[PDB]
Amino acid sequence: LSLINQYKSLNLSSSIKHNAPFINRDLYVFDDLFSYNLGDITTKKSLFND
Amino acid sequence: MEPFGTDERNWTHEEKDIITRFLKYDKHVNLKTAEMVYSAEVESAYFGKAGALAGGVISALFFNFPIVRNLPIIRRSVIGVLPFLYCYTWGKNTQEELRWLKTFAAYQRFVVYHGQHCKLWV
Amino acid sequence: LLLYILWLEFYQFYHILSFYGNINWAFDYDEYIWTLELDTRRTRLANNYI
Amino acid sequence: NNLRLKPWFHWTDEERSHAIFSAYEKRILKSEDLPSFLRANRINNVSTWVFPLIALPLFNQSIFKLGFAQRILLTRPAIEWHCFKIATVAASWLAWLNFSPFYRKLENEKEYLLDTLESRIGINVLDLNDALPRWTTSQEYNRRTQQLYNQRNGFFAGLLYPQEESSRPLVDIASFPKNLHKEKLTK
Amino acid sequence: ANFVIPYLKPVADFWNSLCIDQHQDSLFQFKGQTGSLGTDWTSKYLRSEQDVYNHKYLQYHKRVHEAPELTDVISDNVYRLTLFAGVERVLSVRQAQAILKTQFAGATENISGAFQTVLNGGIFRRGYFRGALLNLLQFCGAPYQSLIWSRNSGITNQVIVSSIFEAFFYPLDTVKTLIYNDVQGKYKGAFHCASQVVQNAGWSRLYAGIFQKLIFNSALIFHLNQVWDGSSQQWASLALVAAAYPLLVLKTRFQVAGTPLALATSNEVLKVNRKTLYAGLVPYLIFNTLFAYEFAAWHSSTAQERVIGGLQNAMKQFSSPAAEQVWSS
Amino acid sequence: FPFLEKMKYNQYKEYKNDYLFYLDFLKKEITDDHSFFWKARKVIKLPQYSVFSFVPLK
Amino acid sequence: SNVTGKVALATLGALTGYGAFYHYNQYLNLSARWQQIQENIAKDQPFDVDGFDAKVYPWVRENNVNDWEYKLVKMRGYFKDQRFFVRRKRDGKEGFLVFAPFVTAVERVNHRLKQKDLLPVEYSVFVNLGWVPVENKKDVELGGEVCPPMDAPTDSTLFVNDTFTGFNPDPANPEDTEQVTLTEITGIVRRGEQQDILARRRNWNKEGIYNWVDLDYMGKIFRLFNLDAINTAYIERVVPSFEEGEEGLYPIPATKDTFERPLNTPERHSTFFNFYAATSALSFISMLLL
Ligand SMILES: CCCCCCCCCCCCCCCCCC(=O)OC[C@H](COP(=O)([O-])OCC(O)COP(=O)([O-])OC[C@@H](COC(=O)CCCCCCCCCCCCCCCCC)OC(=O)CCCCCCCCCCCCCCCCC)OC(=O)CCCCCCCCCCCCCCCCC
Ligand SMILES: CCCCCCCCCCCCCCCCCC(=O)OC[C@H](COP(=O)([O-])OCC(O)COP(=O)([O-])OC[C@@H](COC(=O)CCCCCCCCCCCCCCCCC)OC(=O)CCCCCCCCCCCCCCCCC)OC(=O)CCCCCCCCCCCCCCCCC
Numbered sequence A: 001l002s003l004i005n006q007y008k009s010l011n012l013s014s015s016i017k018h019n020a021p022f023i024n025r026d027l028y029v030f031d032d033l034f035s036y037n038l039g040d041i042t043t044k045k046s047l048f049n050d
Numbered sequence B: 001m002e003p004f005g006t007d008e009r010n011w012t013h014e015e016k017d018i019i020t021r022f023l024k025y026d027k028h029v030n031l032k033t034a035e036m037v038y039s040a041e042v043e044s045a046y047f048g049k050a051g052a053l054a055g056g057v058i059s060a061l062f063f064n065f066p067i068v069r070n071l072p073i074i075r076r077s078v079i080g081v082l083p084f085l086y087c088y089t090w091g092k093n094t095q096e097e098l099r100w101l102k103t104f105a106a107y108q109r110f111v112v113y114h115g116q117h118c119k120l121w122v
Numbered sequence C: 001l002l003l004y005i006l007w008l009e010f011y012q013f014y015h016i017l018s019f020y021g022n023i024n025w026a027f028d029y030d031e032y033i034w035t036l037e038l039d040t041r042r043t044r045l046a047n048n049y050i
Numbered sequence D: 001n002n003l004r005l006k007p008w009f010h011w012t013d014e015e016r017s018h019a020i021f022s023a024y025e026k027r028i029l030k031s032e033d034l035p036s037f038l039r040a041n042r043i044n045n046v047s048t049w050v051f052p053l054i055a056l057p058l059f060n061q062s063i064f065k066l067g068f069a070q071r072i073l074l075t076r077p078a079i080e081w082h083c084f085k086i087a088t089v090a091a092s093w094l095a096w097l098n099f100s101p102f103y104r105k106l107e108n109e110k111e112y113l114l115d116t117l118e119s120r121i122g123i124n125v126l127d128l129n130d131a132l133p134r135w136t137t138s139q140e141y142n143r144r145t146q147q148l149y150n151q152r153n154g155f156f157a158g159l160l161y162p163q164e165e166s167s168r169p170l171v172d173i174a175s176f177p178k179n180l181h182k183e184k185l186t187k
Numbered sequence E: 001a002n003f004v005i006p007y008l009k010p011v012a013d014f015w016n017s018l019c020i021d022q023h024q025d026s027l028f029q030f031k032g033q034t035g036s037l038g039t040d041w042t043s044k045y046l047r048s049e050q051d052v053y054n055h056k057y058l059q060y061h062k063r064v065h066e067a068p069e070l071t072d073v074i075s076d077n078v079y080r081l082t083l084f085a086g087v088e089r090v091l092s093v094r095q096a097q098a099i100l101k102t103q104f105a106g107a108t109e110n111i112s113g114a115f116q117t118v119l120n121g122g123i124f125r126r127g128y129f130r131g132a133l134l135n136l137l138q139f140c141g142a143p144y145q146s147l148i149w150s151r152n153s154g155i156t157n158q159v160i161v162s163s164i165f166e167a168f169f170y171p172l173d174t175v176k177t178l179i180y181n182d183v184q185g186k187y188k189g190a191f192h193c194a195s196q197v198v199q200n201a202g203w204s205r206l207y208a209g210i211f212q213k214l215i216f217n218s219a220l221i222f223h224l225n226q227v228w229d230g231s232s233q234q235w236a237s238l239a240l241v242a243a244a245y246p247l248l249v250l251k252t253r254f255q256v257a258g259t260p261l262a263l264a265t266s267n268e269v270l271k272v273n274r275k276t277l278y279a280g281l282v283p284y285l286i287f288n289t290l291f292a293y294e295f296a297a298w299h300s301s302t303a304q305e306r307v308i309g310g311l312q313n314a315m316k317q318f319s320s321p322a323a324e325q326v327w328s329s
Numbered sequence F: 001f002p003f004l005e006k007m008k009y010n011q012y013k014e015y016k017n018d019y020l021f022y023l024d025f026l027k028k029e030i031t032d033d034h035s036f037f038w039k040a041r042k043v044i045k046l047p048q049y050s051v052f053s054f055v056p057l058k
Numbered sequence G: 001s002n003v004t005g006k007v008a009l010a011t012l013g014a015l016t017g018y019g020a021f022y023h024y025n026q027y028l029n030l031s032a033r034w035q036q037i038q039e040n041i042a043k044d045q046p047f048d049v050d051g052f053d054a055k056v057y058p059w060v061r062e063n064n065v066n067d068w069e070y071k072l073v074k075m076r077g078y079f080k081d082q083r084f085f086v087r088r089k090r091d092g093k094e095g096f097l098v099f100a101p102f103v104t105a106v107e108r109v110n111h112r113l114k115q116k117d118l119l120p121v122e123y124s125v126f127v128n129l130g131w132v133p134v135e136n137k138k139d140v141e142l143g144g145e146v147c148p149p150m151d152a153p154t155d156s157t158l159f160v161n162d163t164f165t166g167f168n169p170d171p172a173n174p175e176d177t178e179q180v181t182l183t184e185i186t187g188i189v190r191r192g193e194q195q196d197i198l199a200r201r202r203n204w205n206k207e208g209i210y211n212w213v214d215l216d217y218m219g220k221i222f223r224l225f226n227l228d229a230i231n232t233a234y235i236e237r238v239v240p241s242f243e244e245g246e247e248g249l250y251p252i253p254a255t256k257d258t259f260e261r262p263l264n265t266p267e268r269h270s271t272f273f274n275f276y277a278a279t280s281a282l283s284f285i286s287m288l289l290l
């Protein structure tokens, strides 16, 4: 009864992309924008900001 | 935590509803007071329908009572339905009285717990 | 009328005599359960005398 | 184990029949063990209700033609003769009720069922007994057992009457909550 | 305990079930927890206080988004069919009273006279409840089948389906009217009345006033939809059905004519005093307004929105009136 | 006193009203159901027997 | 009584004909719906219920059980020990459908972690583990291994409590209270049944006899918090055809071609229509002869 038309947004990622003050993340430039000397990455690694 | 005296205004229905809702769903009230209010509600809900059902049965009998049956419909219906009205009002009154008395006891307990009475202290 | 007054007196007398039995629900959080507890009553002696 | 006192050595016929019925309704005892007991009970009822009918002609042919019977018939009023006949017939019927071979067979079958229950549920068979209501007799309990058997084996075993098979949830008693507390009263 | 309590326990249990919340009692019956918080008594009462309205909403949704159920429809219309089933007979008698013989049998030509005529036979099969089974069957039939075959449909489609089903089941309505207006007990039952009608007059005798019945049914369906929607034009629709009421009274007169129960025949029914063409209008309107048909299946979008909004407004009372506005949630 | 004790059979009270799990309860292990056991009131050293009876003579 | 007999026979024939027409239309509609459902299942396009959906299932959220019924759903979580048995026949063999709670989400609402180990709030849904014969019901083990736990995720950043579900997929969580094992299941969401005396579906709660699934009663007895979601609908686990006897594993999980069928079936409706048509034809023939 209380759930009637209460959650009209489900994909939080879409809203974050559309409203956050950041450059578009769909640009293909980031694939080879810079060059780095890294290797031996046998497992997925994530970058933490700051 | 409210005016006292003959000249003061008795509790209104809206005030009672607000106070009972506050006692039920407020965070400053204690678990014992909340349980008292809940027990009041659950144990008082019965009379409201018990009185109505008893009144319905009694009115059904009175409609066929020896004189009511032979009386004309104009007054027969009223005479037969009067017991239903009496029982319904009795049930509603007793339900409200029990619920409000226990809610007022809970309110007193809350007032003593939070020291909001000008002449109550340990 | 005598029957009515008798019922009223009996109801008040029953309330007064039931006062001394202090029954209260206690909620134990470890089991999350309400249990009845019986205890004595402490009150001003004037109330007991009346 | 002749010298061993069984848990139900003191139980009466009513208590034994009530225990059998309670076990069957609680499904401790399956429907496959009833038919012999039911047949024995029906035979016992038939014999009990038919004994006087067969006995009275025999008494007329042999006992009532004896010397003392003829003396009573001839030298005393017809009322007293009828009273004597009724009294002797009643005494014979009571003796039959006490020492009927069919009654003994029914008791033996009940004993077999009680032994099966004891083997199945250990000493807890005593827990199947309760304060039986007064005036409810062993015949009544046997009738109730037969009625439950017929209801469970009839066409309405799942439409109008509960099914014999048990669908109780599978839980652990050592951890599942209980409806009653040992000393206090729960809400 | 062995001869009274076993027979008295069911009555007390039924009384308690009627006078107590079954869902709340069931929730409180199960005590303890299996490993999840919120199974305590305090939470269950809090949950049930909202589950009342939640169950109301769920039942309404089921009556709308699921196939209609005869038990649900009867529960919705219990008052109109269970306790006040003699008002239908009294209204029919009042409508047909112009061409009946009751005015010569200690009854006036008014609603009070119709009530007295109905009650002179008592409360049972020959009195107040006469024809109650026929009315219940007709309701469990034509309206129920119409709901089944026109669930969630527009006004036009609903009217068409209801008209078709009323035409199909019309003879039952005629037999019910004859049983209602049989004051001297000429007919022993519905089958006997139908057999007598067929034997005396042709099968067409059972289809008298079908067109006016269908027109009045269409008007009543329109009024029901308007009142369910709640628009202010519900009063205009009430006036329209009041104006169409003479169609209903003519239908009843035609059904009750051409028989020993009436003083007039089919030809004479048309040429009856026009001053009695609104016999029972106010009683009929009052009865229908107080005990209207609660056909949730035919409720339109506006009615569903109204019901949901009312339920939400009722649900909005479960917050603390003195809740403090906190900077941090 | 042990005969007067009623908490021994308290476990059966729940199932006397709730039959749903009565079969599961009966499927438990029998330790002291409808039985009395008196602990050794005298010191006894007899390797032949692993348990001794101390039930009242009467 | 010739007229009375004729009238009664005509009424019976008319009612029977209307019933036959209604049953025929219902049979056609049900056959079309069943064919569409079979095609949808064969398409093999399941929906993964994870994230916020795991805590608030979409069908419960939008009250769209009608639209979501007969849809393949992939869920993740841990089962509860308790099991529920409902009498039912599969392939003409007597047996019991087995239902188990499946905790799809967990919420922790205790801030005094170091003082009290408050129990969490578990949001769960009933899932049908399969069907077992009556004689083999005792073979079902409490808290049995339904499906092997899903392999731990390769990503290291996923070893945290999910913002929505709250689960931690770490095989060996450093916090004992946070430890939990997750398993993946695939099933079909099914609508809860209802009492039906005519269909021989009667439940005796006190005697522990169940013939129709009562989600509300099951949730109440198992003491589950997510009672409304449980009552909304339940899932029927579906596994690819194993094509083996699997001795010992008596509870047979449902398959796309052998999942439990609804009470209302095209075969039943066709049988009812045939009976009504035969009765109406007999009545009409009798009327014509008379
Ligand atoms: C938990 C449940 C507990 C239930 C408890 C039941 C206890 C029963 C006790 C019976 C024994 C004592 C009866 C004493 C009666 C009064 C004696 C007296 O002085 O009167 C003299 C009086 C004559 O007076 P008079 O001055 O010499 O002359 C007056 C003139 O004759 C001119 O006449 P008059 O105009 O003056 O008429 C006077 C009349 C006028 O007053 C009334 O009209 C009475 C109105 C109140 C009726 C109350 C009924 C009982 C209470 C309710 C029962 C449960 C209902 C549940 C419904 C559930 C629905 C879902 O008042 C009476 O006399 C009172 C009784 C009249 C009865 C009339 C017929 C009733 C029919 C309906 C009930 C039976 C249906 C059976 C159907 C077939 C079988 C299934 O004669 C009588 O009328 C006596 C009748 C005695 C026999 C009554 C038998 C009743 C049986 C009821 C069984 C239980 C219900 C079963 C229901 C089953 C279906 C659901
Ligand atoms: C708590 C109060 C309410 C209690 C209600 C009762 C509850 C009882 C318990 C429940 C169960 C039982 C159910 C009821 C059983 C029967 C009760 C009974 O005896 O009552 C009948 C009883 C009459 O029985 P009777 O003794 O047989 O009548 C004497 C004659 O036999 C009459 O013979 P007749 O039938 O042949 O009459 C001929 C006909 C004459 O034929 C006509 O109709 C004449 C037509 C002339 C032509 C007009 C059209 C012209 C052309 C069209 C022009 C415009 C359109 C142009 C279009 C152009 C394009 C095409 O007469 C009339 O139409 C007028 C009759 C009197 C009307 C009285 C209205 C009272 C209003 C009350 C105040 C206002 C409403 C307040 C509501 C709220 C209260 C809180 O009624 C009363 O006397 C008053 C009853 C209480 C009135 C309640 C008001 C109605 C409430 C419900 C409806 C909603 C409101 C409607 C008005 C407002 C709309 C905005």
Ligand SMILES: CCCCCCCCCCCCCCCCCC(=O)OC[C@H](COP(=O)([O-])OCC(O)COP(=O)([O-])OC[C@@H](COC(=O)CCCCCCCCCCCCCCCCC)OC(=O)CCCCCCCCCCCCCCCCC)OC(=O)CCCCCCCCCCCCCCCCC
Pocket (backbone or CB within 6 Å): E081, E082, E083, E085, E124, E125, E129, E130, E131, E132, E133, E134, E135, E136, E137, E140, E168, E171, E172, E175, E188, E189, E190, E191, E192, E194, E206, G007, G010, G011, G014
């Ligand atoms: C509750 C748990 C269960 C709930 C289940 C669900 C409820 C709904 C179920 C509905 C369906 C049930 C199943 C079907 C049953 C069918 C029975 C049957 O055969 O009846 C038929 C019916 C039987 O006729 P009959 O028996 O000779 O006479 C009827 C009597 O007059 C009788 O009518 P009456 O109005 O004069 O009755 C007066 C009324 C006076 O009493 C009352 O009104 C008291 C009750 C008032 C309302 C409730 C108050 C609160 C509860 C009180 C409970 C008290 C105890 C009740 C005990 C009842 C019996 C167990 O009751 C009585 O005194 C009855 C008299 C006893 C003999 C007849 C009835 C047998 C028992 C049936 C019981 C059914 C009850 C169902 C509902 C139960 C609700 C609780 O015949 C017709 O309707 C014939 C119609 C012919 C029309 C013309 C056809 C011409 C040809 C045209 C063909 C079509 C067109 C062709 C094509 C053309 C080209 C397109």
Ligand SMILES: CCCCCCCCCCCCCCCCCC(=O)OC[C@H](COP(=O)([O-])OCC[N+](C)(C)C)OC(=O)CCCCCCCCCCCCCCCCC
Pocket (backbone or CB within 6 Å): B082, B083, C001, C003, C004, C005, C007, C008, C011
């Ligand atoms: C239905 C319509 C038909 C007519 C009905 C007329 C009334 C019929 C009354 C029958 C006799 C009742 C005697 C009850 C005695 C026991 C009362 C008791 O113990 O109280 C319990 C219950 C009360 O229980 P309680 O504990 O809730 O009491 C509440 C107490 N107060 C009000 C202070 C809050 O009694 C009642 O409900 C009311 C009893 C009123 C008794 C009045 C007696 C003096 C007046 C006599 C009037 C005579 C009228 C004559 C006829 C006139 C007709 C027009």
